[PDB]
From a paper:
[name]-M-15 (cefotaximase-Munich-15) is a class A extended-spectrum β-lactamase (ESBL) capable of hydrolyzing penicillins and cephalosporins, including third- and fourth-generation cephalosporins such as ceftazidime and cefepime, respectively. It is predominantly plasmid mediated, disseminated worldwide, and encountered in diverse Gram-negative pathogens, mostly Enterobacterales, but occasionally also in nonfermenters. [name]-M-15, like other class A SBLs, employs an acylation-deacylation mechanism to hydrolyze β-lactam antibiotics, utilizing four invariant residues: Ser70, Lys73, Ser130, and Glu166. In this study, ultrahigh-resolution X-ray crystal structures and mass spectrometry revealed the mechanism of PAS inhibition of [name]-M-15, an extended-spectrum β-lactamase (ESBL) globally disseminated among Enterobacterales.
One possible explanation for this is the presence in KPC-2 of a Cys69-Cys238 disulfide bond, a distinguishing feature of carbapenem-hydrolyzing class A enzymes. To test whether a disulfide could prevent cross-link formation, we constructed a [name]-M-15 Gly238Cys mutation ([name]-M-15G238C) which already contains a Cys residue at position 69 and used mass spectrometry to investigate whether this mutant could support cross-link formation. Formation of a Cys69-Cys238 disulfide was confirmed by determining the crystal structures of both mutants. Neither mutant prevented cross-link formation, as evidenced by the presence of a peak corresponding to a mass loss of 18-Da on 24 h of exposure to tazobactam or enmetazobactam. Thus, presence of an active-site disulfide bond is not sufficient to abolish cross-link formation by [name]-M-15 and does not account for the absence of cross-link formation in KPC-2. As a further investigation of the importance of active-site movement to cross-link formation, we sought to constrain the [name]-M-15 active site through introduction of the equivalent disulfide by directed mutagenesis. This, however, did not affect the ability of mutant enzymes [name]-M-15G238C and [name]-M-15G238C/G239_Y240insA to form cross-links, indicating that differences in disulfide content (and possibly a concurrent reduction in active site flexibility) are not the explanation for the differing abilities of [name]-M-15 and KPC-2 to support cross-link formation.
Residue numbers in the entry: 27 to 288
Write the structure that this text describes.
Amino acid sequence: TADVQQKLAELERQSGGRLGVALINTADNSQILYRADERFAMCSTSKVMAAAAVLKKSESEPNLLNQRVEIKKSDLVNYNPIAEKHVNGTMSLAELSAAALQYSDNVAMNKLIAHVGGPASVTAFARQLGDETFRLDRTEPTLNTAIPGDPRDTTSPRAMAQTLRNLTLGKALGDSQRAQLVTWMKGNTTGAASIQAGLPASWVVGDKTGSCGYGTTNDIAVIWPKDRAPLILVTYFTQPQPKAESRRDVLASAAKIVTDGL
Ligand SMILES: [Cl-]
């Protein structure tokens, strides 16, 4: 409705920044879009694509998720909540995937990236799925600069919503791998203040958040409303000032606007 568009424009104006939304409602195959073809820095929301690339590789390598990866001091980056506890030992690729997706651990992201061949390999995986918009250019932590106008490490709301639908509800991954990705995302510990905060308490959510430079504040989610077909929702948000603070409330407000009614 124009009403939903007006409400999103009002929210964006009040927020002071630039808001991007894509909702896919699988009940009727409809979409609600706002700036959905513009690019936004992904921040840690790119961890979903990297974990999915590892899952895809595991379809033909059954030992892959159990493979051990050494964690060294030289692996530490800016935010390492799980990896810092494993320095001088190993973690499996499954454990790194869970740490990336559920605690936003940046060492874990770098190990997923390295395993599949680097940022260009993660990007080539997106391309193989039919996502011609996603680009992972850099590793952690430099992928977080989020400079306005810089296309590095960006995607669009439309593209990420369509790809997340393929990954979590469609057939991008084998049944075992899809279920594993969904379980990991449903177990996220970092999302309660973002999309989830704009939805009724009873709804079930798997999501991945990310915040980075220029007050960029993001969330991408698969949502099971009570007794309804699932939704896919991407809410991206960025601000003019380099040191702007995160605005998870803006993502909650956008989620409420686009799901009201339903
Ligand atoms: Cl500033």
